[PDB]
Amino acid sequence: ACSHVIWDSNSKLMDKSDARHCTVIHSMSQNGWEDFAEKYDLDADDIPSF
Amino acid sequence: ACSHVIWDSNSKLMDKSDARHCTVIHSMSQNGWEDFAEKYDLDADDIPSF
Amino acid sequence: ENRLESILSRFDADWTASDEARREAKNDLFFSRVSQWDDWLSQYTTL
Amino acid sequence: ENRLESILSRFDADWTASDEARREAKNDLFFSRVSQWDDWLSQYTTL
Amino acid sequence: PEQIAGFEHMYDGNDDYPYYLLNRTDENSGDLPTQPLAYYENPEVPQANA
Amino acid sequence: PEQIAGFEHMYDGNDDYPYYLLNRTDENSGDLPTQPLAYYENPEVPQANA
Amino acid sequence: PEQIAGFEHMYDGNDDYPYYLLNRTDENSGDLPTQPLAYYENPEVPQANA
Amino acid sequence: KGDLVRAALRKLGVASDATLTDVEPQSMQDAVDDLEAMMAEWYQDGKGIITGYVFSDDENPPAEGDDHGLRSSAVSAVFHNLACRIAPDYALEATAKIIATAKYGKELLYKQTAISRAKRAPYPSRMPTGSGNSFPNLNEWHYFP
Amino acid sequence: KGDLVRAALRKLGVASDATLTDVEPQSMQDAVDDLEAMMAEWYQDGKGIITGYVFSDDENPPAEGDDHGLRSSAVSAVFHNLACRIAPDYALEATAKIIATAKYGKELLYKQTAISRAKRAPYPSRMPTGSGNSFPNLNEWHYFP
Amino acid sequence: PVFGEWGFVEDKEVYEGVVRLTKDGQRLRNMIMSFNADIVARTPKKKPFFW
Amino acid sequence: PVFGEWGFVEDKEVYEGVVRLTKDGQRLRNMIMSFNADIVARTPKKKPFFW
């Protein structure tokens, strides 16, 4: 979580309830990306980045 | 189990319930392979690999 | 890509996963040794 | 292969299994010694 | 300087060498490199202070 | 260097030899290889620091 | 080498002999085999490390 | 007269020089051989003092004016030590300053070599590999590599 | 004159040389025998100092101009020590530098040998075999192998 | 599958039992122990030096 | 069949009783002990040296 969920919305408290972003990141295997592009319906031949 | 059951489906949890593979491996004696090819009906003269 | 060759699919999902059944497995089965077989490793005939 | 010679079958399943009743058995019966017979091994006449 | 001269290299902090060398001789005499019997005394915190 | 010279081989860390050898003689004198009475003093952590 | 020479045989590890022998004499002088007063000091683990 | 000390001649020439004498018959052979012997006691077939000295060819050419091939730094030593060795031939004790400079020189010849021959031996047959050390290679320590 | 010191002649030739004298009758036999004796006290039938020195054949040929077969590194030693031994024949104390060089040389002859003769003895009659050591072979330690 | 200590690191799965941490020190123990055995076995006993 | 400690390793069956681990140290004990006995048996007693 230290390196995947990131949310400096200038949130000034512990449950980050005053936040408005909270962008999280996924790392996944090839087969995982195919199955992910399956669920959320996406071009499996795109290949993402971050 | 550390070297026989292998299942990186990018499974992100402990009971590996979110997995979709879980390929396991068998090592077996000659007589064991004959009896195995017997059960699952296979060519006993094939001899497998992994 | 598209390549519905079944074995090429199944094998190319094991091969991909056995790259973790590496870094870790390498260690893990190695502990089943400093306890199970013997606490010395990789010479097996010294004087 | 096909070779229903009965003894060749039974004997060629013991022989095959006595390759484990080796690595282990070798040790196992050897403990029935550092306790049962005597704690010294393989000389039996020194000065 | 004379006794260490030539291999001050060996006295810097390396655990590279198996021992320490010292110059034995010197034209104009037979050098007296009485193996280094002298180190600077450790800091002590006087009894009075204590 | 002179006293160890010839068999510095024996001082590297081998437990191969039964003892240590030292050169006794030297043309131009009778060498004084007073068996190596001198080692570099161990690190100590001054009393003051302690 | 000179003092042990002749019977380095006796210093290898045998408990075969009742004692150790040393060469006494040497043409060109009266040898000074001051019975071996010098051994290599034991490994110590410095106080500082401790 | 001649300049640099390049021939095994010059060694002996200036060896005699540093003693006191200045005579030259065939005794230059009876004294060059003294030198070749010396420069062979030293340099125990390569386990002794390294000087770059070049020897008789095992071809008959055993001496005289042929080059010595010593490093410049080694000369003032070999010929000082030479002086001491041949001085008894002429019923002579070499002066103090000479024996001193010979003693001094002979050490310096070996100095840089001694530093080369230091060398720490590798980790023992045993010795764990160490968890901190990544990439296992040979488990424990190589002890041979 | 002659070159390299190859004959047991030369040893004695240059032995006398290094003392001071330069005479040659049959006394070269009475002094070569001194040498053969020495080179046999040394090298106690092979348990002494190894030099490569070659002896009389047990065929009558006991001396003179026949080869010595010494290593190059050994010469400046045998003939220096020779000098000391025969000097009393001519009512003579060998000079300091000589006794020094003889003392020095004789050590060097044995140096490489002494290193060879080090050798650690094997594990004792007893001594456990050790669980870490795989392939049992002889249980405990061989002590003979 | 049962797991002892389990988790992820560099998005790489990771796990271990009780044994893993002990390995390093345990080897030292065995080594030093073996070294000492050598010390007792091969090593000249106390005897006098005589001419 | 009864088993003490039992399991598989390299797909090779494996098992042991209490005794196996002790073997190594116990031999050392016996050896050192025997060595010492020699020390006491064969060894000159304390007596004076005289001309």
XYZ file of C-alpha atoms in Angstrom:
736
model
C 0.000 0.000 0.000
C 2.930 2.351 0.655
C 3.750 2.331 -3.048
C 0.426 1.555 -4.741
C -2.307 3.671 -3.168
C -1.274 7.316 -3.389
C -3.557 10.223 -2.563
C -2.002 13.535 -1.627
C -5.102 15.593 -2.116
C -3.536 17.564 0.701
C -5.610 15.230 2.891
C -4.855 16.249 6.445
C -6.042 13.158 8.355
C -5.553 9.458 9.074
C -8.536 7.769 7.403
C -7.853 9.991 4.395
C -11.598 10.739 4.415
C -10.972 14.362 3.417
C -9.224 13.093 0.287
C -10.635 13.363 -3.238
C -8.275 11.211 -5.336
C -6.655 8.044 -3.947
C -5.177 6.799 -7.238
C -4.174 3.134 -6.848
C -1.883 1.080 -9.048
C -2.006 -2.489 -10.302
C 0.891 -4.640 -11.379
C -0.248 -7.784 -13.154
C 0.959 -10.749 -15.191
C 0.363 -11.026 -18.912
C -2.521 -13.425 -18.333
C -3.799 -11.090 -15.632
C -3.874 -8.152 -18.026
C -5.731 -10.219 -20.605
C -8.306 -11.199 -17.989
C -8.427 -7.599 -16.782
C -8.943 -6.191 -20.261
C -11.636 -8.855 -20.473
C -13.588 -7.683 -17.429
C -13.408 -3.924 -17.971
C -13.556 -4.427 -21.753
C -10.337 -3.044 -23.239
C -7.842 -3.606 -26.044
C -5.736 -6.522 -24.810
C -3.068 -5.481 -27.318
C -2.648 -2.004 -25.832
C -0.301 -2.658 -22.891
C -0.465 0.069 -20.157
C 2.146 1.979 -18.116
C 2.717 4.042 -14.939
C 4.344 -28.157 -2.258
C 6.890 -25.347 -2.685
C 8.125 -26.984 -5.867
C 5.130 -28.980 -7.119
C 2.026 -26.808 -6.908
C 2.666 -23.591 -8.823
C -0.018 -21.038 -9.619
C 1.055 -17.477 -10.329
C -2.159 -16.390 -11.912
C -1.155 -13.114 -10.315
C -3.215 -14.418 -7.389
C -2.987 -11.750 -4.728
C -4.057 -13.711 -1.629
C -3.253 -16.510 0.815
C -5.819 -19.212 0.014
C -5.037 -18.585 -3.660
C -8.801 -18.508 -4.194
C -8.481 -15.744 -6.778
C -6.237 -18.050 -8.811
C -7.257 -19.697 -12.087
C -4.433 -22.182 -12.758
C -2.670 -24.067 -9.947
C -0.697 -26.477 -12.140
C 0.668 -29.314 -9.975
C 3.409 -31.791 -10.792
C 3.827 -35.482 -10.146
C 7.048 -37.421 -9.906
C 6.471 -41.160 -10.001
C 8.238 -44.509 -10.277
C 8.106 -46.603 -13.429
C 5.465 -48.857 -11.904
C 3.631 -45.743 -10.746
C 3.519 -44.333 -14.264
C 2.213 -47.623 -15.608
C -0.529 -47.632 -12.976
C -1.194 -43.950 -13.658
C -1.448 -44.451 -17.415
C -3.780 -47.279 -16.460
C -6.190 -45.119 -14.460
C -6.359 -42.084 -16.745
C -6.012 -44.323 -19.813
C -2.802 -43.339 -21.608
C 0.048 -44.767 -23.670
C 2.292 -46.400 -21.072
C 5.104 -46.279 -23.631
C 4.972 -42.491 -23.985
C 7.023 -41.319 -20.982
C 6.239 -37.680 -19.915
C 8.367 -34.655 -18.937
C 8.332 -31.279 -17.132
C -1.715 -11.989 -29.841
C -3.974 -14.749 -31.170
C -2.587 -18.303 -30.973
C -5.221 -20.729 -29.662
C -2.728 -23.598 -29.796
C -3.902 -25.160 -26.534
C -0.570 -26.483 -25.268
C 1.155 -23.249 -26.277
C -1.406 -21.536 -24.068
C -1.179 -23.822 -21.059
C 2.564 -24.229 -21.286
C 2.997 -20.487 -21.784
C 1.135 -19.890 -18.539
C 3.200 -22.384 -16.528
C 6.476 -21.103 -17.947
C 5.341 -17.610 -17.056
C 4.384 -18.643 -13.509
C 7.513 -20.764 -12.925
C 9.440 -17.492 -12.930
C 8.125 -16.989 -9.403
C 8.240 -20.666 -8.515
C 11.871 -19.648 -9.012
C 13.011 -16.739 -6.837
C 10.943 -18.040 -3.949
C 10.814 -21.797 -4.665
C 14.606 -21.652 -4.924
C 14.749 -20.613 -1.281
C 11.764 -22.595 -0.057
C 12.959 -26.023 -1.173
C 16.370 -25.077 0.105
C 15.037 -24.918 3.685
C 13.668 -28.403 3.229
C 17.364 -29.206 3.440
C 19.136 -27.231 6.183
C 16.616 -29.294 8.142
C 15.496 -32.254 6.055
C 18.671 -33.484 4.262
C 21.782 -31.837 5.761
C 23.055 -28.400 6.837
C 26.015 -28.381 4.424
C 25.574 -27.620 0.701
C 27.209 -28.065 -2.747
C 30.464 -30.012 -2.295
C 29.637 -33.541 -1.110
C 33.085 -35.193 -0.978
C 35.627 -32.927 0.748
C 38.594 -34.068 2.814
C 7.351 -52.761 -22.523
C 5.580 -56.130 -22.463
C 7.314 -58.917 -20.512
C 4.831 -60.812 -18.323
C 7.618 -62.995 -16.934
C 6.262 -62.992 -13.378
C 9.552 -63.031 -11.472
C 11.024 -60.442 -13.830
C 8.057 -58.283 -12.857
C 8.166 -58.828 -9.102
C 11.952 -58.722 -8.946
C 12.013 -55.644 -11.152
C 9.757 -53.857 -8.688
C 11.805 -54.787 -5.613
C 15.070 -53.854 -7.329
C 13.475 -50.573 -8.292
C 12.246 -49.965 -4.729
C 15.500 -51.029 -3.031
C 17.040 -47.905 -4.529
C 15.285 -46.012 -1.748
C 15.689 -48.765 0.823
C 19.211 -47.566 0.045
C 19.773 -43.849 0.603
C 17.537 -43.937 3.665
C 17.905 -47.551 4.861
C 21.659 -46.963 4.730
C 21.275 -44.331 7.437
C 18.404 -45.935 9.314
C 20.093 -49.263 10.040
C 23.206 -47.327 10.879
C 21.464 -45.711 13.854
C 20.549 -49.157 15.077
C 24.268 -49.191 15.815
C 25.475 -45.914 17.348
C 22.998 -47.172 19.941
C 22.460 -50.904 19.494
C 25.925 -52.338 18.655
C 28.643 -49.728 19.331
C 29.404 -46.046 18.696
C 32.595 -46.710 16.709
C 32.499 -47.854 13.041
C 34.557 -49.624 10.328
C 37.931 -50.608 11.818
C 37.375 -53.244 14.515
C 40.945 -54.101 15.598
C 43.010 -50.933 16.138
C 45.819 -50.510 18.648
C 58.642 7.918 8.487
C 61.658 5.831 7.514
C 60.453 2.490 8.918
C 57.013 2.680 7.363
C 58.319 4.344 4.187
C 57.800 2.237 1.105
C 54.608 0.638 2.326
C 52.535 3.193 4.185
C 50.070 1.669 1.776
C 49.552 -1.203 4.194
C 48.558 0.895 7.196
C 45.520 2.820 5.950
C 42.823 0.316 6.874
C 43.002 -2.449 4.290
C 42.298 -5.990 5.360
C 43.938 -6.761 2.021
C 47.366 -7.824 3.267
C 48.329 -10.831 5.460
C 50.700 -8.785 7.639
C 52.575 -5.522 8.041
C 55.991 -4.825 6.593
C 58.720 -2.656 8.039
C 61.974 -1.385 6.610
C 64.908 -3.062 8.339
C 68.020 -1.408 6.963
C 69.383 2.021 6.182
C 72.708 3.073 4.644
C 74.577 4.998 7.345
C 73.508 2.499 10.054
C 71.622 -0.661 10.959
C 68.093 0.663 11.393
C 66.460 0.236 14.801
C 62.832 -0.433 13.805
C 62.007 -1.908 17.204
C 58.619 -3.267 16.165
C 56.111 -0.374 16.787
C 55.781 -0.494 20.559
C 54.142 2.939 20.831
C 50.518 3.951 20.394
C 48.794 7.164 21.414
C 47.039 6.547 24.728
C 43.238 6.280 24.758
C 40.914 9.052 26.046
C 40.069 8.396 29.679
C 37.742 10.789 31.539
C 39.816 11.650 34.675
C 39.028 9.998 37.977
C 38.272 13.440 39.393
C 35.634 14.081 36.751
C 34.156 10.656 37.390
C 60.355 -8.377 4.313
C 63.679 -10.184 4.588
C 62.701 -12.622 7.362
C 59.472 -13.724 5.735
C 60.970 -13.549 2.238
C 61.053 -16.915 0.501
C 57.932 -18.221 2.172
C 55.377 -15.448 2.484
C 53.404 -18.281 0.966
C 52.921 -19.725 4.434
C 51.349 -16.651 6.025
C 48.286 -16.015 3.835
C 45.790 -18.195 5.710
C 46.572 -21.781 4.760
C 46.145 -24.461 7.362
C 48.250 -26.444 4.896
C 51.595 -26.261 6.675
C 52.631 -27.701 10.088
C 54.474 -24.541 11.155
C 55.921 -21.228 10.044
C 59.373 -20.766 8.603
C 61.670 -17.790 8.977
C 64.907 -16.838 7.289
C 67.782 -17.053 9.765
C 70.839 -15.787 7.924
C 71.900 -12.938 5.686
C 75.241 -12.249 4.008
C 76.557 -9.014 5.535
C 75.461 -10.088 9.058
C 73.831 -12.703 11.258
C 70.148 -11.906 10.820
C 68.181 -10.925 13.921
C 64.788 -12.527 13.185
C 63.730 -12.352 16.819
C 60.660 -14.542 16.385
C 57.791 -12.119 15.414
C 57.035 -10.524 18.760
C 55.018 -7.658 17.282
C 51.385 -7.518 16.229
C 49.217 -4.489 15.491
C 47.125 -3.773 18.589
C 43.405 -4.571 18.522
C 40.669 -1.894 18.196
C 39.458 -0.896 21.645
C 36.678 1.693 22.009
C 38.249 4.212 24.450
C 37.263 4.184 28.108
C 35.986 7.734 27.637
C 33.612 6.659 24.886
C 32.480 3.744 27.010
C 64.263 -24.237 8.576
C 67.680 -25.169 9.889
C 66.663 -26.134 13.435
C 63.782 -28.352 12.368
C 65.636 -29.624 9.294
C 66.302 -33.347 9.404
C 63.148 -34.184 11.314
C 60.307 -31.985 10.118
C 58.860 -35.472 10.047
C 58.108 -35.174 13.739
C 56.033 -31.999 13.574
C 53.202 -32.933 11.186
C 50.729 -34.328 13.728
C 52.032 -37.765 14.689
C 51.582 -38.944 18.234
C 54.162 -41.503 17.140
C 57.219 -39.985 18.792
C 57.983 -39.512 22.528
C 59.356 -35.997 22.029
C 60.555 -33.411 19.521
C 64.091 -33.156 18.236
C 65.998 -30.034 17.258
C 69.300 -29.524 15.509
C 71.861 -28.112 17.918
C 74.954 -27.404 15.866
C 75.957 -25.816 12.595
C 79.381 -25.501 10.970
C 80.148 -21.773 10.839
C 78.764 -21.222 14.370
C 77.176 -22.705 17.476
C 73.508 -22.768 16.510
C 71.087 -20.759 18.647
C 68.002 -23.016 18.588
C 66.509 -21.314 21.630
C 63.765 -23.890 22.134
C 60.792 -22.666 19.959
C 59.470 -19.821 22.079
C 57.345 -18.317 19.306
C 53.873 -19.248 18.120
C 51.496 -17.284 15.907
C 48.998 -15.525 18.166
C 45.406 -16.805 18.297
C 42.450 -15.068 16.576
C 40.750 -12.752 19.031
C 37.673 -10.750 17.975
C 38.689 -7.182 18.983
C 37.274 -5.616 22.120
C 35.687 -2.940 19.961
C 33.788 -5.522 17.928
C 32.728 -7.225 21.130
C 86.082 7.014 -20.516
C 83.018 4.756 -20.587
C 79.657 6.015 -19.358
C 76.590 4.148 -18.043
C 77.075 0.813 -16.270
C 75.439 -1.453 -18.873
C 77.790 -4.418 -19.358
C 78.242 -7.123 -16.739
C 81.724 -5.694 -17.289
C 80.832 -2.424 -15.602
C 79.426 -4.194 -12.560
C 82.814 -5.784 -12.002
C 84.678 -2.705 -13.174
C 82.952 -0.498 -10.628
C 82.786 -3.285 -8.064
C 86.583 -3.276 -7.967
C 86.354 0.500 -8.224
C 84.347 0.828 -5.004
C 86.789 -1.405 -3.130
C 89.981 0.536 -3.902
C 91.829 -1.377 -6.621
C 92.014 -0.745 -10.374
C 93.612 -3.750 -12.124
C 92.328 -5.787 -15.084
C 93.771 -9.091 -16.403
C 91.606 -12.155 -17.054
C 90.711 -11.817 -13.375
C 87.647 -10.057 -14.761
C 86.327 -13.527 -15.572
C 87.338 -15.022 -12.230
C 85.225 -12.214 -10.781
C 82.362 -12.005 -13.257
C 81.663 -15.638 -12.473
C 81.571 -14.622 -8.829
C 78.847 -12.197 -9.906
C 76.850 -14.690 -11.987
C 76.894 -17.118 -9.061
C 75.665 -14.409 -6.706
C 72.926 -13.342 -9.102
C 71.721 -16.932 -9.024
C 71.842 -17.523 -5.303
C 69.642 -14.480 -5.262
C 66.742 -15.278 -7.569
C 66.368 -18.918 -6.592
C 65.297 -19.879 -10.099
C 62.585 -17.243 -9.831
C 61.573 -17.689 -6.197
C 64.326 -15.370 -4.998
C 65.025 -11.705 -5.666
C 63.748 -10.411 -9.006
C 66.219 -8.068 -10.694
C 65.783 -8.453 -14.446
C 69.342 -9.747 -14.572
C 70.030 -11.782 -17.729
C 72.123 -14.949 -17.574
C 74.510 -16.927 -19.764
C 72.514 -18.356 -22.672
C 73.081 -22.024 -21.767
C 74.868 -21.332 -24.961
C 78.581 -21.276 -24.110
C 78.669 -17.389 -23.709
C 78.979 -17.350 -19.902
C 80.316 -13.841 -19.211
C 82.204 -10.562 -19.783
C 80.947 -7.528 -21.680
C 77.440 -8.776 -22.491
C 74.572 -6.788 -20.944
C 73.210 -7.370 -17.451
C 69.754 -5.960 -18.132
C 69.214 -4.860 -14.548
C 66.752 -2.130 -13.684
C 68.449 1.202 -13.013
C 67.348 0.976 -9.371
C 69.103 -2.363 -8.869
C 72.604 -1.444 -9.970
C 74.013 0.408 -6.948
C 73.100 -2.763 -5.075
C 74.406 -5.635 -7.154
C 77.783 -4.022 -7.609
C 78.076 -3.035 -3.955
C 77.318 -6.625 -2.938
C 79.697 -7.747 -5.663
C 82.424 -5.653 -4.108
C 82.021 -7.422 -0.782
C 82.152 -10.875 -2.358
C 85.303 -10.363 -4.424
C 87.226 -8.294 -1.909
C 88.476 -11.453 -0.162
C 90.006 -12.495 -3.487
C 92.361 -9.523 -3.155
C 92.889 -10.120 0.576
C 90.569 -7.304 1.600
C 87.864 -6.418 4.083
C 85.249 -4.218 2.434
C 84.866 -0.874 4.185
C 81.920 -0.281 6.505
C 80.034 2.136 4.266
C 80.054 -0.544 1.583
C 78.712 -3.473 3.632
C 76.081 -1.003 4.843
C 75.079 0.059 1.345
C 75.044 -3.553 0.202
C 72.812 -4.584 3.106
C 70.566 -1.611 2.333
C 70.500 -2.247 -1.403
C 69.690 -5.933 -1.168
C 66.610 -5.163 0.905
C 65.351 -2.609 -1.621
C 65.650 -5.087 -4.469
C 63.104 -7.308 -2.767
C 60.855 -4.591 -1.351
C 58.414 -4.161 -4.225
C 58.432 -7.921 -4.726
C 57.644 -8.579 -1.060
C 54.624 -6.326 -1.349
C 53.541 -8.284 -4.411
C 53.923 -11.583 -2.605
C 51.743 -10.536 0.346
C 48.362 -11.763 -0.926
C 45.577 -12.978 1.348
C 44.421 -16.573 0.916
C 40.738 -17.140 -0.048
C 37.932 -18.259 2.246
C 38.322 -21.887 3.481
C 36.925 -25.135 2.052
C 33.994 -24.615 4.442
C 32.716 -21.163 5.413
C 29.013 -20.443 4.873
C 27.972 -18.596 1.730
C 26.240 -15.761 3.591
C 22.618 -14.698 3.148
C 23.653 -11.121 2.446
C 25.614 -12.248 -0.587
C 23.205 -12.553 -3.504
C 23.605 -14.850 -6.504
C 24.557 -18.174 -4.805
C 27.024 -19.413 -7.425
C 29.018 -21.957 -5.440
C 27.395 -22.441 -2.026
C 29.518 -21.773 1.055
C 32.879 -20.486 -0.184
C 34.700 -21.477 -3.381
C 38.085 -22.099 -1.728
C 39.399 -22.585 -5.274
C 37.346 -20.454 -7.739
C 90.858 -18.687 -19.370
C 88.075 -21.142 -18.511
C 84.477 -19.978 -18.185
C 81.498 -21.432 -16.277
C 82.167 -23.449 -13.113
C 81.065 -26.879 -14.395
C 83.773 -29.334 -13.291
C 84.224 -30.395 -9.680
C 87.569 -28.898 -10.677
C 86.143 -25.396 -10.783
C 84.578 -25.722 -7.345
C 88.047 -26.336 -5.932
C 89.671 -23.933 -8.374
C 87.462 -21.079 -7.261
C 87.323 -22.327 -3.689
C 91.058 -21.702 -3.400
C 90.447 -18.569 -5.463
C 88.056 -17.094 -2.894
C 90.497 -17.795 -0.042
C 93.532 -15.991 -1.506
C 95.866 -18.652 -2.903
C 96.409 -19.821 -6.491
C 98.504 -23.018 -6.515
C 97.790 -26.369 -8.196
C 99.721 -29.651 -7.694
C 97.993 -32.948 -6.913
C 96.653 -31.066 -3.889
C 93.590 -30.636 -6.087
C 92.768 -34.235 -5.204
C 93.547 -33.831 -1.511
C 90.995 -31.012 -1.704
C 88.422 -32.436 -4.098
C 88.024 -35.330 -1.699
C 87.419 -32.760 1.012
C 84.590 -31.541 -1.220
C 83.126 -34.978 -1.968
C 83.121 -35.702 1.759
C 81.313 -32.442 2.503
C 78.774 -33.054 -0.261
C 77.959 -36.329 1.457
C 77.737 -35.084 5.013
C 75.218 -32.744 3.486
C 72.704 -34.933 1.707
C 72.609 -37.716 4.286
C 72.060 -40.347 1.626
C 69.073 -38.335 0.479
C 67.714 -37.180 3.829
C 70.036 -34.182 3.895
C 70.383 -31.184 1.598
C 69.388 -31.822 -2.018
C 71.765 -30.204 -4.500
C 71.795 -32.356 -7.617
C 75.471 -33.005 -6.947
C 76.726 -36.142 -8.716
C 79.097 -38.542 -6.972
C 81.927 -40.923 -7.825
C 80.435 -43.819 -9.787
C 81.286 -46.510 -7.211
C 83.345 -47.139 -10.258
C 86.912 -46.132 -9.369
C 86.528 -42.545 -10.874
C 86.403 -40.685 -7.541
C 87.272 -37.111 -8.551
C 88.839 -34.244 -10.538
C 87.484 -32.659 -13.702
C 84.256 -34.648 -13.986
C 81.023 -32.623 -13.702
C 79.347 -31.707 -10.421
C 75.857 -31.311 -11.849
C 74.815 -28.745 -9.270
C 71.979 -26.323 -9.934
C 73.217 -22.852 -10.843
C 71.754 -21.522 -7.596
C 73.783 -23.946 -5.473
C 77.270 -23.131 -6.707
C 78.117 -19.907 -4.897
C 77.338 -21.937 -1.779
C 79.191 -25.216 -2.165
C 82.387 -23.497 -3.179
C 82.158 -20.901 -0.435
C 81.687 -23.670 2.148
C 84.458 -25.560 0.407
C 86.754 -22.592 0.899
C 86.184 -22.637 4.647
C 86.862 -26.366 4.927
C 90.144 -26.425 3.003
C 91.518 -23.144 4.334
C 92.924 -24.891 7.415
C 94.917 -27.138 5.074
C 96.868 -24.037 4.057
C 97.053 -22.735 7.631
C 94.346 -20.155 7.087
C 91.296 -18.623 8.717
C 88.641 -17.885 6.099
C 87.701 -14.205 6.003
C 84.489 -13.044 7.638
C 82.612 -12.260 4.424
C 83.223 -15.845 3.346
C 81.981 -17.643 6.468
C 78.992 -15.310 6.226
C 78.265 -16.165 2.602
C 78.765 -19.850 3.309
C 76.357 -19.713 6.249
C 73.907 -17.835 4.047
C 74.294 -20.151 1.081
C 73.875 -23.387 2.983
C 70.540 -22.170 4.307
C 69.306 -21.326 0.815
C 70.168 -24.762 -0.518
C 67.710 -26.292 1.924
C 65.052 -23.593 1.755
C 62.916 -24.943 -1.072
C 63.389 -28.438 0.310
C 62.272 -27.433 3.807
C 59.089 -26.044 2.322
C 58.543 -29.338 0.512
C 59.090 -31.301 3.700
C 56.489 -29.349 5.694
C 53.429 -31.532 4.999
C 50.535 -31.929 7.433
C 49.833 -35.428 8.738
C 46.380 -36.915 7.963
C 43.480 -37.244 10.374
C 44.117 -39.760 13.227
C 43.245 -43.468 13.465
C 40.020 -42.334 15.161
C 38.278 -39.061 14.309
C 34.609 -39.252 13.300
C 33.734 -39.259 9.623
C 31.496 -36.190 9.838
C 27.855 -35.992 8.755
C 28.560 -33.049 6.459
C 30.967 -35.146 4.444
C 28.954 -37.139 1.919
C 29.936 -40.489 0.402
C 31.039 -42.450 3.528
C 33.904 -44.384 1.938
C 35.926 -45.383 4.989
C 33.989 -44.449 8.136
C 35.671 -42.110 10.619
C 38.997 -41.068 9.083
C 41.254 -43.157 6.833
C 44.481 -42.432 8.744
C 46.228 -44.310 5.927
C 44.244 -43.905 2.652
C -2.281 -24.315 0.531
C -1.062 -23.531 4.058
C 1.353 -20.656 4.642
C 3.639 -19.653 7.477
C 4.733 -16.053 7.078
C 3.382 -14.815 3.749
C 3.108 -11.578 1.794
C 4.192 -9.586 -1.237
C 7.227 -7.360 -1.780
C 8.201 -6.076 -5.211
C 4.803 -7.343 -6.308
C 6.635 -10.630 -5.947
C 5.022 -13.290 -3.734
C 7.030 -14.080 -0.625
C 6.904 -16.557 2.246
C 8.963 -18.470 4.810
C 8.876 -20.849 7.755
C 10.689 -20.671 11.090
C 13.864 -22.192 9.654
C 14.991 -19.517 7.186
C 16.360 -16.901 9.625
C 18.334 -19.475 11.605
C 20.275 -20.764 8.601
C 23.062 -18.186 8.654
C 24.048 -18.525 12.301
C 23.524 -22.265 12.342
C 26.107 -22.722 9.583
C 28.617 -20.671 11.531
C 27.954 -22.904 14.517
C 28.621 -26.013 12.463
C 31.731 -24.540 10.859
C 33.396 -23.213 13.994
C 32.481 -26.494 15.645
C 34.167 -28.424 12.813
C 37.181 -26.131 12.896
C 37.573 -26.858 16.588
C 37.353 -30.594 15.961
C 40.313 -30.237 13.580
C 42.164 -28.329 16.290
C 41.724 -31.253 18.663
C 42.423 -33.966 16.089
C 45.314 -32.774 13.931
C 47.667 -30.859 16.219
C 50.910 -31.841 17.982
C 50.488 -32.829 21.618
C 52.582 -31.292 24.409
C 55.998 -32.925 24.533
C 59.533 -31.665 25.307
C 62.065 -30.421 22.801
C 65.464 -32.076 23.111
C 68.712 -31.781 21.271
C 4.639 -49.280 9.971
C 5.382 -46.772 12.742
C 7.372 -43.625 11.980
C 9.184 -41.066 14.093
C 9.931 -37.971 12.057
C 8.839 -38.657 8.488
C 8.454 -36.796 5.213
C 9.645 -36.338 1.642
C 12.444 -34.186 0.241
C 13.652 -34.527 -3.348
C 10.577 -36.677 -3.852
C 12.706 -39.088 -1.860
C 11.151 -40.594 1.271
C 12.854 -39.530 4.478
C 12.673 -40.335 8.182
C 14.630 -40.490 11.442
C 14.484 -41.201 15.156
C 15.831 -39.195 18.082
C 19.309 -40.699 17.715
C 20.417 -39.369 14.327
C 21.211 -35.749 15.255
C 23.205 -36.756 18.322
C 25.607 -39.000 16.413
C 28.057 -36.289 15.357
C 28.654 -34.722 18.756
C 28.573 -38.049 20.561
C 31.487 -39.352 18.499
C 33.497 -36.256 19.336
C 32.758 -36.893 22.995
C 33.985 -40.475 22.718
C 37.076 -39.463 20.747
C 38.204 -36.586 22.950
C 37.467 -38.825 25.901
C 39.674 -41.567 24.445
C 42.388 -39.082 23.565
C 42.429 -37.923 27.158
C 42.717 -41.506 28.395
C 45.866 -41.848 26.295
C 47.163 -38.636 27.831
C 46.773 -40.150 31.291
C 48.061 -43.617 30.375
C 51.042 -43.140 28.061
C 52.878 -40.049 29.275
C 56.008 -39.591 31.433
C 55.282 -38.777 35.063
C 56.842 -35.814 36.859
C 60.389 -36.665 37.910
C 63.646 -34.675 38.175
C 66.294 -34.405 35.485
C 69.807 -35.171 36.728
C 73.195 -35.275 35.151
